[PDB]
Amino acid sequence: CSNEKARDWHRADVIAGLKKRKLSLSALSRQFGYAPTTLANALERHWPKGEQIIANALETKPEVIWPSRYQAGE
Protein backbone atom coordinates (compact mmCIF):
# COMPACT_ATOMS: atom_id res chain seq x y z
CA CYS A 1 0.00 0.00 0.00
CA SER A 2 2.61 2.58 1.07
CA ASN A 3 5.76 2.60 -1.06
CA GLU A 4 7.38 4.81 1.67
CA LYS A 5 10.83 3.47 0.86
CA ALA A 6 9.78 2.67 -2.73
CA ARG A 7 13.23 1.96 -4.29
CA ASP A 8 15.28 4.84 -2.90
CA TRP A 9 17.15 4.81 0.42
CA HIS A 10 14.79 4.52 3.44
CA ARG A 11 14.45 7.78 5.39
CA ALA A 12 16.56 5.73 7.80
CA ASP A 13 19.00 4.41 5.17
CA VAL A 14 19.66 8.06 4.42
CA ILE A 15 20.23 9.27 7.99
CA ALA A 16 21.32 5.89 9.43
CA GLY A 17 23.72 5.37 6.51
CA LEU A 18 24.98 8.98 6.57
CA LYS A 19 24.83 9.37 10.40
CA LYS A 20 26.88 6.15 10.47
CA ARG A 21 29.90 8.46 10.28
CA LYS A 22 29.05 11.96 11.53
CA LEU A 23 26.13 13.52 9.60
CA SER A 24 22.59 14.57 10.55
CA LEU A 25 20.11 16.45 8.31
CA SER A 26 20.10 18.98 11.19
CA ALA A 27 23.88 19.57 11.06
CA LEU A 28 24.12 19.82 7.25
CA SER A 29 21.28 22.36 7.39
CA ARG A 30 22.90 24.92 9.72
CA GLN A 31 26.33 24.17 8.20
CA PHE A 32 25.09 25.93 5.02
CA GLY A 33 22.36 28.08 6.68
CA TYR A 34 19.10 26.65 5.26
CA ALA A 35 16.87 26.00 8.30
CA PRO A 36 16.56 22.30 9.31
CA THR A 37 13.09 22.33 7.67
CA THR A 38 14.55 22.95 4.19
CA LEU A 39 17.00 20.03 4.31
CA ALA A 40 14.23 17.73 5.64
CA ASN A 41 11.57 18.88 3.13
CA ALA A 42 14.27 18.17 0.50
CA LEU A 43 13.10 14.52 0.62
CA GLU A 44 9.77 15.07 -1.24
CA ARG A 45 9.95 18.78 -2.21
CA HIS A 46 10.90 19.94 -5.74
CA TRP A 47 14.56 20.87 -5.07
CA PRO A 48 17.20 18.50 -6.51
CA LYS A 49 19.87 20.95 -5.23
CA GLY A 50 19.08 19.92 -1.62
CA GLU A 51 20.09 16.32 -2.36
CA GLN A 52 23.42 17.62 -3.70
CA ILE A 53 24.19 18.98 -0.22
CA ILE A 54 23.65 15.48 1.24
CA ALA A 55 25.38 13.48 -1.52
CA ASN A 56 28.25 16.00 -1.37
CA ALA A 57 28.96 14.79 2.19
CA LEU A 58 29.49 11.25 0.82
CA GLU A 59 31.56 12.71 -2.04
CA THR A 60 29.10 10.70 -4.21
CA LYS A 61 26.29 11.69 -6.62
CA PRO A 62 22.58 12.04 -5.61
CA GLU A 63 21.83 9.47 -8.36
CA VAL A 64 23.22 6.89 -5.87
CA ILE A 65 20.76 7.61 -3.03
CA TRP A 66 17.74 8.07 -5.40
CA PRO A 67 18.38 5.81 -8.46
CA SER A 68 14.71 5.04 -9.31
CA ARG A 69 14.07 8.79 -9.65
CA TYR A 70 16.99 9.20 -12.07
CA GLN A 71 16.80 6.85 -15.09
CA ALA A 72 17.36 9.04 -18.17
CA GLY A 73 20.67 7.10 -18.50
CA GLU A 74 23.85 8.83 -17.27
**Own/partner pairs, 4-13, CB within 8 angstroms, 24+ separation:** 6/68, 7/67, 7/68, 8/65, 8/66, 8/67, 8/68, 8/69, 9/65, 9/66, 11/43
Helices 25-32 and 48-57, axial angle in degrees (round to 10): 110
What sections of the chain are H helices per DSSP?
A: 11-19, 25-32, 36-41, 48-57, 62-65
Residues shown for the chain: 74
Class of the CATH domain delimited by 1-74: mainly alpha
Method: NMR
Q: Which of 16, 22, 17, 50 lies closest to 36, judged by CA?
A: 50
Say how far apart CA 52 and CA 55 lie, in whole Å: 5
Q: What is the DSSP letter of 41?
A: H
Residue-range domain boundaries for the chain: 1-74
Say how far apart CA 71 and CA 31 lie, in whole Å: 31
Contact 56, 65 (CB under 8 A): no
